[PDB]
Design a protein around this ligand. Structure first.
Ligand SMILES: CCCCCCCCCCCCCCCCCC(=O)OC[C@H](COP(=O)(O)OCCN)OC(=O)CCCCCCCCCCCCCCCCC
Ligand SMILES: CCCCCCCCCCCCCCCCCC(=O)OC[C@H](COP(=O)(O)OCCN)OC(=O)CCCCCCCCCCCCCCCCC
Ligand SMILES: CCCCCCCCCCCCCCCCCC(=O)OC[C@H](COP(=O)(O)OCCN)OC(=O)CCCCCCCCCCCCCCCCC
Ligand SMILES: CCCCCCCCCCCCCCCCCC(=O)OC[C@H](COP(=O)(O)OCCN)OC(=O)CCCCCCCCCCCCCCCCC
Ligand SMILES: CCCCCCCCCCCCCCCCCC(=O)OC[C@H](COP(=O)(O)OCCN)OC(=O)CCCCCCCCCCCCCCCCC
Ligand SMILES: CCCCCCCCCCC1=C(C)C(=O)C(OC)=C(OC)C1=O
Ligand SMILES: CCCCCCCCCCCCCCCCCCCC
Ligand SMILES: CCCCCCCCCCCCCCCCCCCC
Ligand code: SF4
Lengths: 102, 197, 314, 60, 160, 100
């Protein structure tokens, strides 16, 4: 359609002009103007928790856009999914996995 | 009457002059001081930064903890012998263009502390653009020094680009404020008696 | 070559370019506006001497950052150093690229929408990490890992806070979301979703009170790119919560763009007041609040929203 | 943490926002140097001068 | 839509080739992120909008974030001082083996019936419908798989 | 009008590239990177196959594939952290003690 190809061209022009704007800004900044330890594993733990719960979040993302088309049995399935998610979260909290302080 | 870094004349096409004026306007209207606390003079500096004086009105409130982003180094305090290499390193970490304001008698000359552990003025090892007498200078003296620095910045010539043109920095030789205000200062006859408020 | 299809193509391209220029100029103009409004909150004036009302302070700052000496650290990774402000600008700019500001005024009427916003947040974390690592400083690196751990702790429920609005709308599209608020704005049913998304949006933008800095080695115009990128992120998050929780352009009397601009201006002023008012919590308190309170709140909110929707389905 | 102290903290944050907003509705405390001259008390210790006698000769 | 698919596939191939031949771990992860963005563009060109969205959100927004986190943790160290993988006596053999397997798989691919991918956009609503319909136990046991990975990675990745 | 053969060829190319990176690199981090490349190529192949048949099954299998990929990346990076903690190097040829 003409409207969808107009929106595609608008999005492409938006991306190109934004990239060109920031690149030209950096180029003008460079051109103008004269010249003259072992980290603690809690970082890995919190990033790993973010990865796992982001995958669980993607499952809930897929569920949320089709809640009406899934019916009450989909609600029961997603309630079991969310309950397992919350049991894992309670497990992580209670063993001090999510406690940054010692 | 300029100074090239030698006493030379004014090097300033007419479009290059307008571009230099625009650059100087943008530089003097956006001055970012470095957050550096030495002694009591820094307390009066940050007092000028607060609401009752509002140094933000001149565009000079963005107080940076990083010397890279700062344009102005205000040496506001005594230049102790242990702190002098720190001051020199923080000045060296800055980028062109950079300006220096000595605030207070300690930073000017050492002040009352002509003592074994004090460097007698910060101009002993870094170049200073504006000096403020006082111990401490009041906040509006720091504002007046900021306007003096702005007036000095607005009449200096710097290269627009590092690949085109003369790369030397031409700083104007301003008339001294003492000679400028001698007309109005000597003409003073009577002041208010100290017994009043 | 004069054809109405080409006219519509150029009109849509011009509208997208106008939206881009307006949002970038708004980010810069309210960098200056944050300075002025912090002055207003702190019983002073702020910059009001460079031009009428201080409106030329931004131009002076722009010129100063342009003609500041460009300095890359000698022992640093040059490509990553240049790439971090690149991402910090473009990620939230493209996040704004899906916001509908008016009926017929939208850059991309995508079928994903807030999913594209989630992609842009997942690149903004890269911007912060690359800024920290490329500085070749251990203090900056530690500060960057702490800040990125915070933004992961709040990105973990940003999408789930949006999922209540998505569930009520039944679609990922932003126009469907603003059309589902024809009767009642989503702030009333999705109030817990509103507070969780507001907290997560403030936290992933690294705004107060969620802020060994990793910007200390950045100078010249790269620091300006970081500044305008954070401000564009503020504008984008404000416009997104206007469209998602406050109807968007819907209003009884004033024109729709005026309503959208007024709601966005109120929320950006709320950002300024949030900076001026709250103190900084400790880092462990911030992550514990993100992991122990807000994520279960989003999950329970999604469950309650689904139960309410399926009850109303006859 | 406790829900009661969470609600107390939320109310305290709302109160802090309210005070800062009402203080935004207040009057400015800035003395506009240099447009507004600084008042100095008569015995203020600033620039040093040498004065003259009533007959006009210098006092030093 | 064809041009976008081919340019994104070419970018992904070149970025993967730069990944498996680079020395700097952060640079390798950066080209890997570029390859993941390219493969997401491939997904968007084929109408799999949800798959490309998850490719940027999860694969190029969580997993490689974790890789970048671990690389910053290691502070990467007898790696660039060796460069053993670019000597031919190490890499010619495995490259020959991978080329032979690629030739066999491509020959198997070329003998299939192709009506062409029409690229009709498949929304996340249909994916969510079939996810909680025909694939209920897939979702539940995938939650259990994520739980298993969480427990294993917590048990191993501690410091005591 | 995009051939299924071309998508499967691209996925196969990325798979054998990930396998080559997994084999030729002695660094465990690059082995994990190669493993991520292979599993992403397999997920791309499933997406291509699902898009050819007009079914959501390819995207469902993509979702399962990236769930597996996230979990094995977490486990492998934890193992890599333990190896770097107790050996101070990531040379996978060093850990070869059990043999025969
Ligand atoms: C260089 C890029 C040039 C522009 C590329 C094309 C942009 C438009 C586009 O991707 O359109 C395809 C699709 C349209 O989606 P929609 O209209 O909702 O679908 C209805 C079916 N026609 O829209 C999409 O698939 C949108 C999702 C992909 C958008 C990618 C944008 C760049 C992402 C990476 C940025 C990295 C920054 C660092
Ligand atoms: C686009 C526009 C967006 C503009 C911004 C709008 C949203 C702003 C969101 C700001 C979020 C700030 C979140 C701060 C969380 C802090 C959590 C925490 O741990 O606080 C610590 C404190 C004490 O906790 P405790 O464990 O007892 O510590 C004792 C140990 N010595 O714990 C407490 O004091 C408990 C209470 C913590 C904070 C609760 C939430 C407050 C949210 C901010 C106020 C919002 C007001 C309304 C805003 C407008 C709404 C229309
Ligand atoms: C779904 C059911 C999951 C199992 C049952 C959960 C009961 C409520 C959560 C719980 O166990 O709360 C107590 C727990 C105490 O944790 P503690 O080590 O004391 O440190 C926090 C300081 N207050 O505090 C926590 O675990 C922190 C709160 C976690 C809440 C997760 C969601 C619970 C269900 C809603
Ligand atoms: C959501 C509702 C949360 C609870 C609101 C009512 C309680 C409350 O505001 O508690 C916070 C604080 C408690 O008072 P306190 O800190 O003990 O100071 C002595 C003065 N009574 O009280 C205050 O800070 C004063 C009242 C502030 C009310 C703010 C608005 C609350 C409703 C939104
Ligand atoms: C180097 C810079 C990046 C170059 C690669 C990406 C851009 C390639 C050129 C795309 C131009 C737009 C285009 O061809 O769009 C076609 C299609 C539109 O979508 P659709 O509605 O399905 O098409 C049928 C039309 N009725 O578009 C699509 O279906 C999707 C378009 C591609 C996916 C979005 C962009 C991905 C960018 C990845 C960047 C990776 C890092 C560099
Ligand atoms: C990289 C992180 C940048 C954070 C923002 C820095 C720029 C704004 C500084 C605000 C400010 C602070 C905090 C401040 O403490 C202060 O008082 C000395 C000011 O002068 C009035 C300020 O302007
Ligand atoms: C912070 C706000 C950012 C907005 C970015 C997009 C601006 C688009 C401007 C569109 C203006 C016309 C809108 C349609 C007509 C209705 C309003 C007419 C009076 C302005
Ligand atoms: C220190 C020990 C190092 C061991 C490295 C092992 C590397 C194995 C490389 C195998 C290469 C095979 C090349 C192709 C062989 C012919 C084709 C397959 C058989 C028909
Ligand atoms: S000049 Fe006086 S007020 Fe200033 S630092 Fe020295 S002692 Fe303190």
């Amino acid at each position: 359609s003409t409207e969808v190809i107009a929106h595609h061209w608008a999005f492409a022009i938006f991306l190109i002009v934004a990239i060109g704007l920031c690149c030209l800004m950096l180029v003008g900044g460079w051109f103008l103007g004269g010249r003259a330890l072992r980290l603690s594993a809690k970082f890995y733990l919190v990033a790993m928790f973010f990865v796992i719960f982001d995958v669980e979040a993607l499952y809930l993302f897929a569920w949320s856009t089709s809640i009406r088309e899934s019916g009450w049995v989909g609600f029961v399935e997603a309630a079991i999914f969310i309950f397992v998610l919350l049991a894992g979260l309670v497990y992580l909290v209670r063993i001090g996995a999510l406690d940054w302080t010692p | 009457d300029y100074t090239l870094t030698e006493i030379v004349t004014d090097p300033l096409n007419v479009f290059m002059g307008k571009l230099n004026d625009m650059v100087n306007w943008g530089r003097k209207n956006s001055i970012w001081p470095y957050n550096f606390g030495l002694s009591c003079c820094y307390v009066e500096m940050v007092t000028s930064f607060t609401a009752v004086h509002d140094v933000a009105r001149f565009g000079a409130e963005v107080l940076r903890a990083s010397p890279r982003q700062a344009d102005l180094m205000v040496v506001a305090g005594t230049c102790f012998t242990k702190m002098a290499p720190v001051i020199q390193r923080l000045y060296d970490q800055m980028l062109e263009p950079k300006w220096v304001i000595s605030m207070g008698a300690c930073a000017n000359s050492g002040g009352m502390y002509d003592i074994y552990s004090v460097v007698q003025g910060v101009d002993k090892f870094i170049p200073v653009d504006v000096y403020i007498p006082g111990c401490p200078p009041r906040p509006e003296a720091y504002m007046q020094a900021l306007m003096l620095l702005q007036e000095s910045i607005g009449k200096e010539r710097r290269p627009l680009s590092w690949v085109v043109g003369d790369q030397g920095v031409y700083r104007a030789n301003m008339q001294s404020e003492r000679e400028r205000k001698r007309g109005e200062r000597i003409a003073v006859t009577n002041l208010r008696t100290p017994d009043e408020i | 070559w004069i054809s109405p299809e080409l006219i519509e193509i150029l009109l849509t391209i011009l509208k997208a370019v106008v939206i881009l220029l307006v949002v970038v100029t708004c980010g810069a103009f309210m960098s200056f506006g944050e300075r002025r409004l912090l002055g207003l909150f702190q019983n002073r004036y702020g910059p009001n001497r460079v031009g009428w009302g201080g409106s030329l302070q931004l131009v002076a700052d722009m010129i100063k950052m342009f003609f500041k000496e460009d300095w890359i650290p000698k022992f640093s990774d040059r490509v990553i150093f240049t790439l971090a402000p690149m991402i910090a600008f473009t990620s939230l700019l493209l996040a704004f690229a899906i916001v509908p500001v008016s009926p017929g005024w939208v850059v991309a009427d995508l079928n994903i929408g807030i999913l594209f916003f989630l992609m842009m947040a997942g690149l903004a974390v890269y911007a912060v990490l690359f800024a920290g690592w490329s500085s070749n400083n251990k203090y900056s690196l530690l500060g960057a890992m702490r800040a990125s751990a915070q933004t992961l702790s709040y990105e973990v429920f940003l999408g789930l806070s949006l999922m209540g609005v998505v569930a009520q709308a039944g679609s990922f599209n932003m126009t469907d979301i603003v059309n589902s608020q024809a009767h009642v704005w989503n702030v009333i049913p999705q109030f817990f979703g509103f507070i969780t998304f507001a907290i997560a949006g403030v936290a992933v933008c690294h705004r107060h009170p969620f802020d060994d800095g990793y910007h200390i080695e950045y100078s010249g115009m790269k620091f300006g790119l970081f500044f305008v990128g954070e401000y564009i992120g503020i504008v984008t998050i404000s416009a997104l919560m206007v469209t998602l929780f406050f109807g968007g352009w819907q209003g009884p009397l004033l024109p729709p763009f005026i309503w959208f601009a007024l709601k966005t201006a109120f929320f950006m002023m709320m950002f300024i007041l949030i900076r001026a008012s709250l103190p900084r919590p400790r880092y462990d308190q911030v992550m514990s609040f993100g992991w122990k309170i807000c994520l279960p709140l989003t999950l329970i909110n999604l469950l309650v929203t689904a139960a309410v929707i399926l009850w109303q389905a006859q | 943490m406790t829900l009661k102290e969470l609600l107390v903290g939320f109310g305290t944050q709302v109160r802090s926002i309210w005070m800062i907003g009402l203080h935004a509705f207040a009057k400015r405390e800035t003395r506009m140097y240099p447009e507004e001259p600084v008042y100095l008390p008569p015995r203020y210790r600033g620039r040093i001068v040498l004065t003259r006698d009533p007959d006009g000769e210098e006092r030093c | 839509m064809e041009f976008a698919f081919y340019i994104c596939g070419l970018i992904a191939i070149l970025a993967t080739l730069r990944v498996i031949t680079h020395t700097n771990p952060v640079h390798a992860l950066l080209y890997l992120i570029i390859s993941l963005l390219a493969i997401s563009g491939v997904f968007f060109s084929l109408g799999a909008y949800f798959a490309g969205a998850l490719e940027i959100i999860v694969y190029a927004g969580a997993i490689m974030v974790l890789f970048v986190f671990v690389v910053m943790m290691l502070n990467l160290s007898e790696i660039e001082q060796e460069r053993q993988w670019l000597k031919p006596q190490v890499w010619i053999g495995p490259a020959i083996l991978s080329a032979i397997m690629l030739v066999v798989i491509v020959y198997a691919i070329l003998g299939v019936n192709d009506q062409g991918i029409d690229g009709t956009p498949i929304s996340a609503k249909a994916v969510g419908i079939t996810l909680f319909g025909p694939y209920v136990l897939a979702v539940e046991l995938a939650s259990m798989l994520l739980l298993a990975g969480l427990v294993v990675a917590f048990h191993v990745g501690r410091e005591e | 009008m995009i051939p299924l053969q071309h998508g499967l060829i691209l996925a196969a190319i990325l798979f054998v590239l990930g396998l080559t990176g997994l084999v030729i690199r002695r660094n465990l981090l690059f082995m994990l990177i190669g493993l991520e490349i292979m599993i992403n190529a397999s997920a791309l192949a499933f997406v291509v196959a699902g898009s050819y048949w007009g079914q959501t099954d390819g995207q469902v299998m993509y979702i399962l594939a990236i769930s597996l990929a996230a979990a094995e990346a977490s486990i492998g990076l934890a193992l890599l952290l333990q190896l770097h903690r107790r050996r101070q190097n990531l040379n996978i040829d060093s850990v070869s003690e059990m043999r025969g």
